[PDB]
């Protein structure tokens, strides 16, 4: 059961229960590459831009409110994640993200047609290019969607995750502050510090990571939208760039702004390279914390034996508790280091007016953010909060140390 | 509706619909991290190990044929892709791959039980640990499945994909052999070469990439199975290591062997770092090829204008070039992750296995799929813009050297500078300056004699 | 001839005309690895720490001014770079930088001794450990010196080099604002923009890079000094951490502070990873700029032919066209080197163990190499390429009139396009020669200057 | 004083004691970038190419013996490392390596002129371009020199350094083969193995790395020389490509060959990406080995305490400083590999113009790994001693060996022994004998670590 959809290349059959159009159907056949569909955060962001564009185009007298209001309602369904199944395209597509931009135009158009009681696939009364794509190019819409999605996930997922981790580490600083243990430098026995003090290092690394990320957000919140095809703003109304950013800001509740220079915003994504550097630095910090905890929990008898980590999956030898949350997190952090290398290389590869590595950069950034937010929460809830000190082992080691104690942990 | 499954922690409910057990159900909650499930190639290879172990275990008299035969059939369904929906676990789990090993044990055990008309969840008469996992450990099974999957996907997907690309390139070598063009070095106009010669470079890069990959296969084909928990082989029967590798080889049609040192095989995965090194080098070659083609197709008026690339989407954007180059950069990133994970083994065991399996297999899948798509949707349909190329050939200043024999260096130089200043051709400055007749110009300046030694 | 020097391990011979002592001499023999000695910027920074520590120790009455004043003068010579030949140790040493710290203690001690008329090698009256290293550890001094060195080179070398390039780019924006050219998207012909607008993108990328770098400096300027061995501050006087940071700030003219958590400052160097992330992002920006200019200057006849780049290397008389974009090549090579350095530095940054990260020299070396190369290459690409760039106006205009992009009367706009495309002619030759519109109607309609803004 | 050297741009002064010419002198001011000069292995290799080219040109009758014999002797001094101070140019120059090729031409020409009693700077009777650079282009010469240098250093430095390390690891396999220790998986206590078995893993990692590197050498030994400017071989005599490769092979004693496709050899250096992938893999192996030894040596009292590593410097306790040097070096190689790979991707049309960058990173990787492998071997591995009393004492304290009682006393009674030992902080013996599950003699009869270290 199909309907026939058309574009400048000709007609193509689309499953009747699907909202997408000719171009999306073509891209399914042309880009059979890999496992990865466009991140759902990008799908949502494309919804935000189509909705904000409609609102700005109406306010600037370019769009019939009969058409515009239907676009707005249809795009809300994309925003709310109700139409996720109508985005079947892979990451590994045209480097400007044109196929997914057109996927969003077609879906918003067909759903709006349906809401107005029109015939799906006919492009009437809501046209995918003339109305949904009005005042925009793929060249400026996809990079805008990237920044929105990246900022949103950092602000709503990653930063709360890290604060949650920080709070748990601070609880441990307070609980472990009276526990005096032996320091290790070069892995060799050294002078004493409290377990609370050691944990205060971990906490400080996490707080610092939070601040580093936050500092990079203003860059991320500058949007390409309104630069159109090459950055000149040609074929956009005067004032569109500013207005559509205000509309985007109002939808998201995040202080998005129009980029001061559209040529810079199209030809390069240096803000994402720098923001991803803060996430890269966060991964190095979390790696170290997780690796330390791993080793401090080693044993029960031939290890360092300072920590008792919660046992999350079933045992049988007695006392043998694998630090599996440390393992999940350290694996995630290394993934991020790899993502950062790809993201950086892609960022260097812009040509003239346009960087055509957009889907790759969005996919790497969003994966890093998802992985680190998820693993930070999991490591916190399933490891950190339940960590106990093995005080007898810590005492018994200190009393059998060569290194020498309440008078040895101060300036 | 749910079935009660049990482990040493206690009972937990599993959808009656599902073949997995207590460990897998627990891991769903414990590792709520990311988008990525275990690659289906890893699921298949785990099926392969469990099938091969059951056969090895039966031939060594350790496993009763009533249990073993059911295991073999249940495992065959995993191998064949029929039970993919029964592996719901993420990549980002315990670093030995234990949870996915357990997932495989439970799925095979339950399906085996059902084949025997027993009660699922009861571990009778096919026990997930005692029978499906017999003579093995998570530590030696998951890295074995890693190597099987990596070698299988390279042999069946990547290698044929590159050969397909190589053939399509060699065809263009022959078709474009007669087309003389201006070379570019440092992006500046240079001495000539044929479009065929230029494409012979691309082909040779692909052909060399294949040989580099093939060379790393023997190392991938060495399997950790039989090292058990720490490499010693404790709790595996004498001969199990060798037998199970033979069984795997028979299942796959590929020359898998038992690794000569099981400690090296558990504590590190250097052969995967090396293989992916060949994949990384192939990504660099493919990137350069796609980037060249991208620029050679630039235009139609203000670019290089040498190639006409097929238009697939509704002035032709080189979208297949863009897909392939993005894929190659992804591989560069994957290689850094895989290398670092490789360095991070501790004592008897490397606990970055799922991360390494995921990266290696993603690279292989992307490179293979993009190579095929680049071949079919770009390379085969490439046309030379012969009028553009010839026009440029005639407007070039590079051919001045051919006049030097007959007219001397200083005169040729004077032709070139005047042509450069005036915006004119060499023929216009040579013939119109009296240095040579039009008959002699055509006799001296022969591009066909400047593309060889 | 050689002077006998002594540590807890035994006696060892040191060349008589050298100021280093027993631990330096041992490390020379023990670490025969690589081409790279410690960056001179680190040597300087070690001198700074020794000078500052002496002044901080005197102000807290732990060090006798007779000894202290000689240390200051000796350290000054290290700071001024007068004693660089007395630091023969490689980067590829102990991971805390212990041996370079000791190299600094031994050089400043022997020089101060020689300044007080004493006997070199005798540790009197200036002891390398008890006086020069007083109140400090290698674990807090080397990381302190790393941060001083990195911050000094970013502030004095890289940022001025970037401002210099930005200024030169802004002059080209003004000069090229009138020149309308064809845009390129996916490398395909696209709608018009001016060469000035294109260059304003480059200028904005550099300015943004400058801002990203500056924003990371406060983190770099937090110092580990005072944490001593494991971070607790043991064996350093109360108030030493604050005071020595104040002394370091006075010496360098830069607002260095004492790190609020010494455990974080010794066990990890996350703020270097973050700062180097700004440098990494700068290298990606510079890479794209240089690469664009390389392609825009390509030709003279079979390239893009938009820019004429200064020829800095001799050509042939028979090759009046060819100008290799060699400054572009130096810069792009440097940028790619920075991408590698960033990967190493990040990985090293993840590899701390318990109270101490022991990849310090690796990270110092990579960071400082990145700063040196980017600053140098930015200077050289500016003076030797950017300032001398000329637009090939006739070429750009000829390209603009041979273009098929200005088609956007009737609607054989597509048919004029497709015929010109088919025939290899111009839009004029088919729109006027085909009888669709006159020359004056063509010229009143097809206007690029109306197509470069909203 | 100075000598006037001239190119097409005009005259330039060169220090009288220096053999380089006009282009080398201009390159000093044009590329004031970085600390790094062209590696000396590249200088040597440029010497090799110039000597090989002279011999090849003479043999083909295109170069006068009076001129070439002088080039040959002058180039020999470059090859021997006698003229190193006359190559002052940085890595960070033109991407084809032109400036360094020119440097070699000028140095060879001026020294040759001198040997013939001519005037230095005159280009007579030996001309840097007409004679020393005959049949060559900078596009095909510098990458030939690059491959020569990389292969030479791998073959003479890195491979022997790795065999040296392997040899010292095998000594330790034999020494430690009697010593049974507790395994560690996930860093947790696990079943036993010998310290010899553990070192057998390290030794097999090193042997495997050796084979991986060797396998990539044929690729590295294929040379671009003869491709000239763009790959076609125009301006080179028929058979120059083959002959010059032969001459290079004869100078080096290494099986260099002429690359079967010159366009591939000029536009890309994928062979180097692949070989450096072998070096990258080696660094990952060596990092793991050194990191393990670091941790096994940890203590002396609150670490793992398995190994006593030689004390080279103060000190405290024994800081594992050789492990730190080697691990730092290994991470450096990971970074180099990323830069090298990306450069490899960046070729444009007929020529890759990231040559010096790739050369520099490859040779630095080789130098650092060879040096660090040797130093780690000599100053750490050979002197490593097992702390047998520590290891034995942990082996007897371990809960891991309960599994040996399981066949005799059953799987539930062994666990009861283990949990009680765990809770009480007592040994397996105290709980097994002291709970009447087994006699002292039976415990020694069944709980035998030496029977749990192999197939079962």
């Amino acid at each position: 059961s199909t309907r026939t959809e058309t574009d400048t290349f000709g007609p193509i059959e689309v499953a009747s229960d699907r909202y997408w159009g000719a171009q999306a159907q073509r891209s399914l056949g042309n880009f059979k590459i890999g496992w990865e569909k466009q991140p759902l955060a990008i799908v949502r962001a494309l919804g935000i831009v189509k909705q904000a564009a409609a609102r700005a185009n109406m306010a600037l007298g370019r769009l019939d409110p009969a058409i515009g209001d239907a676009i707005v309602k249809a795009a809300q369904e994309v925003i709310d994640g109700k139409l996720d199944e109508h985005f079947p395209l892979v990451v590994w597509q045209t480097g400007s993200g044109t196929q997914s931009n057109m996927n969003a135009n077609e879906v918003v158009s067909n759903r709006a047609i349906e809401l107005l009681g029109g015939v799906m696939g006919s492009k009437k009364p809501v046209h995918p290019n003339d109305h949904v794509n009005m005042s925009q190019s793929s060249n400026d819409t996809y990079p805008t969607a990237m920044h929105i999605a990246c900022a949103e996930r950092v602000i709503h997922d990653l930063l709360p995750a890290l604060k949650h981790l920080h709070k748990a580490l601070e609880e441990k600083v307070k609980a472990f502050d009276h526990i005096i243990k032996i320091g290790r430098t070069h892995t060799q026995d050294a002078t004493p510090l409290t377990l609370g003090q050691e944990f205060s290092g971990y906490a400080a690394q996490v707080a610092s990571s939070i601040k580093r990320i936050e500092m990079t957000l203003p860059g991320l919140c500058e949007l390409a939208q309104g630069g159109t095809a090459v950055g000149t703003g040609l074929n956009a109304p005067v004032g569109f760039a500013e207005k559509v950013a205000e509309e985007i800001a109002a939808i998201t509740g995040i202080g998005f702004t129009s980029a001061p220079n559209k040529f810079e915003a199209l030809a390069a994504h240096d803000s994402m390279v720098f923001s991803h550097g803060a996430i890269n630095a966060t991964a190095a910090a979390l790696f170290k914390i997780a690796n330390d905890i791993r080793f401090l929990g080693s044993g029960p008898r031939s290890g360092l034996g300072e920590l008792s980590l919660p046992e999350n999956e079933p045992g049988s030898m007695p006392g043998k508790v694998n630090p599996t949350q440390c393992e999940a997190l350290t694996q995630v952090c290394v993934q991020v280091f790899g993502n950062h290398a790809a993201l950086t290389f892609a960022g260097s590869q812009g040509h003239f007016e346009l960087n055509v590595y957009n889907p790759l950069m969005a996919y790497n950034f969003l994966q890093s953010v998802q992985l680190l937010a998820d693993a930070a929460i999991s490591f916190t809830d399933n490891c950190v909060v339940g960590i106990e000190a093995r005080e007898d082992n810590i005492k018994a080691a200190l009393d059998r140390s060569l290194m020498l104690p309440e008078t040895m942990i101060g300036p």
Side-chain angles (χ1 to χ4, degrees), chain A residues 1-316 318-399 401-411:
Chain A
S1 172
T2 61
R3 77 179 168 273
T4 287
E5 290 263 0
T6 290
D7 59 13
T8 63
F9 262 46
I12 191 158
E13 291 184 56
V14 170
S16 305
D17 58 351
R18 288 317 176 221
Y19 286 113
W20 73 71
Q23 297 196 46
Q25 195 71 36
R26 265 183 214 298
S27 306
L28 261 180
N30 290 334
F31 301 91
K32 296 164 173 161
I33 305 166
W35 306 317
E36 302 78 14
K37 292 196 179 88
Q38 292 282 332
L40 302 171
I42 290 291
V43 171
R44 163 181 167 90
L46 285 170
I48 294 170
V49 177
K50 299 316 176 162
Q51 179 171 273
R55 296 205 169 123
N57 283 146
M58 284 188 282
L60 294 167
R62 300 286 171 119
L63 182 60
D64 179 12
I67 312 312
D69 295 348
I71 295 177
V72 165
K73 279 191 213 294
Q76 187 58 54
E77 299 197 341
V78 173
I79 291 159
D80 285 345
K82 294 174 175 163
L83 298 173
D84 288 346
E85 298 296 315
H86 299 89
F87 293 82
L89 308 181
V90 298
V91 167
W92 316 103
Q93 62 177 74
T94 62
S96 64
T98 304
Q99 318 305 129
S100 289
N101 186 52
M102 279 300 320
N103 189 346
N105 293 329
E106 288 170 354
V107 170
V108 170
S109 149
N110 279 327
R111 179 60 173 148
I113 285 175
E114 195 181 46
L115 289 173
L116 293 170
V119 177
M120 299 210 316
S122 72
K123 301 184 183 69
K124 295 174 197 197
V126 190
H127 198 286
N129 191 225
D130 307 348
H131 302 121
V132 184
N133 210 229
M134 175 188 286
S135 301
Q136 62 214 101
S137 167
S138 285
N139 299 351
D140 65 335
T141 295
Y142 194 88
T144 296
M146 274 204 306
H147 275 219
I148 297 159
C150 293
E152 278 209 312
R153 308 275 57 85
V154 166
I155 281 154
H156 300 304
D157 304 340
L158 182 54
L159 290 174
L162 296 168
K163 293 174 192 199
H164 186 57
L165 166 58
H166 179 250
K167 282 196 191 183
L169 294 175
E170 292 277 20
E171 285 168 12
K172 294 302 168 184
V173 168
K174 285 291 166 299
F176 299 155
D177 228 58
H178 72 282
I179 302 162
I180 300 160
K181 53 161 265 165
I182 177 162
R184 296 190 183 80
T185 58
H186 306 256
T187 71
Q188 293 291 108
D189 298 345
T191 50
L193 73 165
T194 69
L195 189 60
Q197 282 172 319
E198 193 170 48
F199 269 74
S200 79
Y202 308 152
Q205 288 179 263
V206 183
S208 290
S209 303
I210 285 162
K211 288 175 176 81
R212 296 171 184 128
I213 294 157
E214 290 177 326
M215 211 186 280
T216 73
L217 292 175
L220 257 196
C221 294
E222 298 179 346
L223 302 179
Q225 202 71 54
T228 64
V230 294
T232 54
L234 179 66
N235 297 140
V238 182
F240 184 77
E242 310 315 311
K243 183 79 193 165
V244 73
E246 296 169 318
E247 294 296 345
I248 291 163
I251 295 165
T252 57
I254 296 166
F256 287 104
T257 65
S258 193
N261 192 292
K262 296 310 196 279
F263 309 98
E264 174 191 30
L266 288 204
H269 303 288
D270 303 326
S271 283
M272 275 174 76
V273 180
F274 183 52
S275 291
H276 203 268
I279 292 162
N280 181 249
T282 303
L286 298 185
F287 184 100
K288 147 75 161 97
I289 298 170
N291 203 247
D292 262 17
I293 289 173
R294 192 220 304 276
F295 279 87
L296 291 173
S298 62
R301 286 177 183 199
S302 290
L304 299 176
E306 311 200 345
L307 292 182
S308 201
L309 312 181
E311 203 184 17
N312 295 318
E313 50 279 325
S316 64
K320 210 217 192 261
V321 176
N322 292 336
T324 58
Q325 294 297 140
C326 297
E327 287 166 13
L329 179 56
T330 53
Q331 281 176 291
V332 156
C333 289
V334 176
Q335 177 69 184
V336 172
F337 304 152
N339 290 359
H340 188 72
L343 190 142
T344 296
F345 290 152
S348 76
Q349 287 302 292
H351 306 122
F352 318 108
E353 280 53 77
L354 202 66
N355 184 293
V356 293
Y357 289 81
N358 291 348
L360 168 69
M361 306 187 65
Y363 165 75
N364 275 96
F365 196 112
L366 293 163
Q367 198 191 46
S368 294
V369 173
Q370 184 69 42
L371 291 177
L372 278 182
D374 286 352
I377 298 291
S378 193
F379 182 71
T380 306
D381 292 345
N382 299 139
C383 186
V384 177
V385 300
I387 292 177
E388 300 300 352
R390 298 180 71 196
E391 301 186 48
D392 281 9
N393 255 355
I394 297 160
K395 192 43 156 59
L398 188 76
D399 294 339
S401 179
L402 290 166
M403 268 310 299
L404 324 176
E406 314 92 76
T407 64
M408 284 179 266
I409 62 176

